[PDB]
Symmetry: C4
């Protein structure tokens, strides 16, 4: 039970890494998804004589709708598995005991936000690709893979690197927005970064200053 919370947190991080990635890139492992689904079913069963009503009156519908699959584009309904991130929100008291723990959580949420923004950036670039101005075409031209096109590894790495440069306000200039939708996404990313980078690294400076 004491170590079960950390396992649940690790599974939540795994699903928050691999659900947006799968939806954005792989839609176009299954056994691991089945295993984590079984583990989350075990956890929701564990969460439950007089405590049943208490759990029913709060944070039961969310877990019930998250655990049950939508397996009857039917694969897009699997994006609802992101609701499991609320579990770490309702148990933040146990995860905030150690300064190392909260520092690792801050780095993890920085990486998670960067990964989600990379998934959105790739989705935009792919939805604009069939309709030589987007970032995918320039990236393919600059790595010797003219549009075929770059591999999934190259596309994901480029998107994550661009998102990290935009969030950290580096702007290497290798890849830059060139379409109106890309420019608006970049502006929104600039606002999001200016907020979250400032807040998170202020918290980090507070932690180290302790």
């Amino acid at each position: 039970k004491a170590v079960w919370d950390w396992l649940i947190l690790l599974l939540v991080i795994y699903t928050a890494v691999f659900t947006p990635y799968s939806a954005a890139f792989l839609l176009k492992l299954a056994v691991v998804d089945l295993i984590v689904d079984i583990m989350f079913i075990v956890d929701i069963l564990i969460n439950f004589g007089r405590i049943a009503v208490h759990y029913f009156k709060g944070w039961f519908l969310i877990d019930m709708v998250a655990a049950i699959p939508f397996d009857l584009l039917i694969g897009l309904l699997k994006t609802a598995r992101l609701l499991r991130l609320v579990r770490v929100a309702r148990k933040l008291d146990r995860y905030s005991e150690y300064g190392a723990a909260v520092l690792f959580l801050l780095m993890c949420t920085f990486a998670l936000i960067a990964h989600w923004l990379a998934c959105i950036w790739y989705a935009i670039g792919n939805m604009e690709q069939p309709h030589r101005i987007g970032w995918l075409h320039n990236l393919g031209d600059q790595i010797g893979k003219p549009y075929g096109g770059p591999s999934i590894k190259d596309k994901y790495v480029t998107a994550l690197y661009f998102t990290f440069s935009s969030l950290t306000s580096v702007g290497f200039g290798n890849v830059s927005p060139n379409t109106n939708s890309e420019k608006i996404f970049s502006i929104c990313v600039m606002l999001i970064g200016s907020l979250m980078y400032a807040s998170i690294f202020g918290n980090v400076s507070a932690i180290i200053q302790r």
Copy 2:
């Protein structure tokens, strides 16, 4: 009167967004402008029998000149409506109790500063076109507009994105100053961007812990 105060704040935001955009881009719907003008006249009437003398010798001498229609260049003279921004700067106590409202107002005024700088940047760029040097010519080249140049949407989005990149100290390298006017404007933008970035984001970091 609180609902009226927040409605007046919304109208002030609307005019601060749409009069400099109009002056910069549109010059070479009216129903919304007429409705907002009527609402501001209603507000100045509501502002007022003992307090009438008090308000007459106060902000009335500014509100009257900010509300008089100049329909006797009229398009350039309509910029005097920017004096309505003092209607919210004189009642900071009304908009400083929610806590999150302060953060929202700070982020909104950051966006408004970016929008005003974008309007000034477009005004600088457009006045240099008749004279491939300049941000407008390069922007048209990037998309494929033989500057028949880019549409108003593309020009505004590019200007806003460049201003946000300069203010956030990213420097994407897609849009860069090349003329001495643009270079001096960018130096001034860098100075005021450092100022506003430091002050505003130190403030928001201050409230983020509360």
Copy 3:
């Protein structure tokens, strides 16, 4: 007496702005410089029988050399007037009586550091005349004035803009170091600019609250 010190501050700002500029650029008006010298001699004269020995044992040794003419490559010795900058390094207690004065002084010294680094950058770019490599050639190609070469206005504006971008960590990419001397100078600029940016803007964020 009170007015005299602020006038001396204005004069020292003038000389700190126009001595490095003249040395860096105009090596290849005099009446204003002569009037400035007259005022500085007047200041040394008023700076004075009991206190005469006190001043003689104090700052007189450094003050006298910085103001006596070195008239006889002979113009390279003119930089001696830069030693007058310490005259305002001893009346901080009088120049910091108002917070707005502190803010103005901080922005003035930031701009002065940018100006001095721009002069050094131009000297570095101009000493590389014997040998497409270098910022001056790139700038001359950018603004459509191939080497001849860009005017002094364009060269100074480009140098100041590059120095400001380096100090504020924007990195527009219009001008980038491309030579070993330029790269080493840029590394030193990055180090000192990060240090002074952090210090100055932390102090500024402290000032705005106070």
Copy 4:
């Protein structure tokens, strides 16, 4: 004894500068490092009978492995000498007695982190070169030394300048990551640089006033 340990710190900085540099670049005079290791052996002898056994039970192994010559991948074994950096890592209570000394050590450790990251970057470039995607090819194209190729001076200066730009979040755009290995290394460098920049410069801003 103070001068002895200050010389210890100086030679520790020397080896931290010159061992990774040699390992990365100079692989293909030794008198300086010969005297340095002789001096380290003399320090070991000085450190040593009541306290000799106590210190033997303590750190004796650390300066035993990092001092014994490996003369007999064969030449790469000298990288074990970087373990001498912990000699100053056990005397922070003494090396942090002065605020100016603290700032000097912070600047030195920032420069050392940049130097180590530049060595790693150059090692990546060299292992990728024989396989224009690499940064070394682009560097050779920029300067007048097309691939032969740039000399060791140019390569090291470019690596250090790029690493400093990445850490300081400038993004000059002259040299930018272009391969998957370079992009991943740049993401890691962005994270590391953000963290260390925040911590170190928060500390520095905490020292400037005092």
